[PDB]
Design a protein around this ligand. Structure first.
Ligand SMILES: [Zn+2]
Ligand SMILES: [Zn+2]
Ligand SMILES: [Zn+2]
Lengths: 114, 62, 265, 46
């Protein structure tokens, strides 16, 4: 009756970017990234790998409200180092970690009999 | 009212398992669930609680 | 070989126990849910009933078939009806099925085995009534009496667990870590003795016991996770892990891709 | 090809119109259902 169409949990709607980046005025060298059609699955994963670049001064993320599949990510880094980059890096480090995983799980598998 | 395909709770299929179960009773006189491969109670309750009405519905004419 | 590492334990066709070490829980969990919800599959989505004298109603059966597990091997070389340039559907993005059931044998049953594959499979593993039943007719759709008929016509499509549960190939997934509460990510309830009143997990044997004399370690983090990936069919227990590991990756990709599309301007 | 009304028991395709009585080709039992449609009905699998 009033509930959306299921496919609104992953498909971007009419003119909408996965990412929208806004500068934060509250404190220097800081930004808030709006991720559209996403959740903890991807949020928390990005949040995590950023407290890894000890070059990142801050990193938390949140889901405004459960009805809407979106989420905000706030990042702040050291002097003259752009966070967007740290987002790239920490994001890449993620794929590699998984790239390795995929592989280590495939050779491993083949060695099975059952 | 027929058997429920896949368990609500976890998702594991369970449509086929009906006849296997209702059989391991009548004959093999038996646990049934456990061998049918229904481990955790979520799916367990699925089968062990179904009351197959369809049978009685089927007893109607046209 | 490199970063995170696997160490499979007893594995079969409908399960895949294994230990995933050298990874942040955060990342284990992420993969966790990805399997549970976002792996492309193939389920019936549109049902065009023609005749139906069954005691079950139209949409009741319709539901049923939505759940019947279809093949989804080369599911990746098919397209989402939403992207295919064909008004409605076609061989290039869907699998059509038939189902006819006339009551002749004076209780006749309708098993998922009774499905035809009227459209052109284009020679790719997909659209098959996954049967694991001992006899050979997995999933009893429904029963019917004397002269009750029933003619359908199903159309299957890609989709995922987000869109609907009838998709996700996962179906239950075990997850545990640090069986001996060393990280103290929990405060055991108890009347007198936590340890005696709280079941010890079968997972406590691949990690060393506590050891009293030691003070509380703090700098230690959640490393190593004992899992188990059950499958319902559609996709091989192994893939339901691989593909998962990969889709999560594809997403992490566009987050970097979408990024690029925003630098030029 | 073609069917109009059916009987509550002896499900035998009938067919009528005004004043032609409201019974059946036998069984007096004056019930009768108005058999399904020709235009197919389309459903969703959720
Ligand atoms: Zn279950
Ligand atoms: Zn198409
Ligand atoms: Zn009559």
């Amino acid at each position: 009756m009033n509930a959306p169409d299921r496919f609104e949990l992953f498909i971007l709607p009419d003119d909408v970017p996965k990412l929208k980046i806004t500068p934060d005025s509250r404190v220097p060298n800081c930004i808030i990234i709006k991720f559209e059609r996403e959740d903890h699955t991807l949020a928390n994963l990005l949040r995590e790998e950023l407290a890894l670049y000890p070059d990142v001064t801050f990193v938390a993320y949140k889901v405004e409200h459960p009805l809407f599949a979106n989420f905000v990510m706030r990042l702040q880094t050291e002097e003259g180092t752009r966070p967007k980059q740290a987002l790239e890096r920490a994001c890449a480090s993620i794929i590699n970690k998984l790239k390795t995983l995929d592989h280590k799980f495939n050779e491993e598998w083949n060695i099975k009999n059952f | 009212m027929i058997i429920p395909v896949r368990c609500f709770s976890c998702g594991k299929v369970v449509g086929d398992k009906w006849d296997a179960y209702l059989r391991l009773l009548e004959e093999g006189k038996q646990d049934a669930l456990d061998e049918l491969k229904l481990k955790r109670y979520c799916c367990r309750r699925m089968v062990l609680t179904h009351v197959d009405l369809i049978e009685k519905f089927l007893r109607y004419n046209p | 070989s490199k970063e995170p590492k696997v160490n499979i334990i007893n594995a079969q066709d409908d399960e895949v126990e294994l230990m995933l070490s050298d990874v942040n829980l955060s990342l284990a969990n992420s993969l966790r849910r990805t399997m549970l919800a976002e792996v492309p599959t193939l389920a019936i989505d549109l049902v065009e009933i023609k005749m139906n004298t069954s005691v079950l109603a139209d949409e009741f059966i319709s539901h049923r078939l939505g759940l019947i597990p279809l093949v989804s091997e080369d599911v990746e070389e098919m397209k989402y009806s939403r992207d295919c340039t064909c008004e409605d559907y076609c061989d290039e993005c869907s699998v059509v099925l038939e189902l006819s059931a006339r009551h002749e044998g004076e209780t006749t049953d309708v098993y998922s085995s009774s499905l035809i594959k009227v459209s052109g499979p284009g020679n790719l593993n997909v659209g098959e009534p996954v049967r694991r039943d001992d006899y050979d007719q997995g999933i009893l759709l429904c029963k019917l009496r004397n002269h009750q008929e029933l003619n359908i016509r199903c159309i299957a499509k890609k989709g995922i667990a987000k869109e609907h549960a009838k998709w996700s190939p996962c179906s239950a997934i075990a997850f545990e870590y640090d069986p001996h509460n060393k990280l103290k990510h929990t405060d055991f309830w108890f009347e007198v003795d936590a340890k005696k009143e709280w079941p010890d997990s079968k997972y406590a044997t691949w990690e060393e016991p506590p050891k009293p004399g030691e003070v509380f370690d703090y700098k230690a983090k959640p490393n190593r996770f004992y899992m188990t990936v059950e499958t319902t069919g559609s996709l091989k227990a192994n893939q339901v892990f691989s593909r998962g590991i990969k889709t999560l990756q594809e997403k992490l990709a566009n987050v970097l891709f979408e990024l690029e599309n925003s630098r030029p301007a | 090809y073609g069917v109009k009304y059916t009987c509550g028991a002896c499900a035998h395709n009938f067919s009528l119109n005004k004043s032609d009585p409201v019974r059946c080709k036998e069984c007096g039992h004056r019930v009768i259902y108005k058999a399904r449609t020709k235009r197919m009905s389309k459903f969703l699998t959720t």
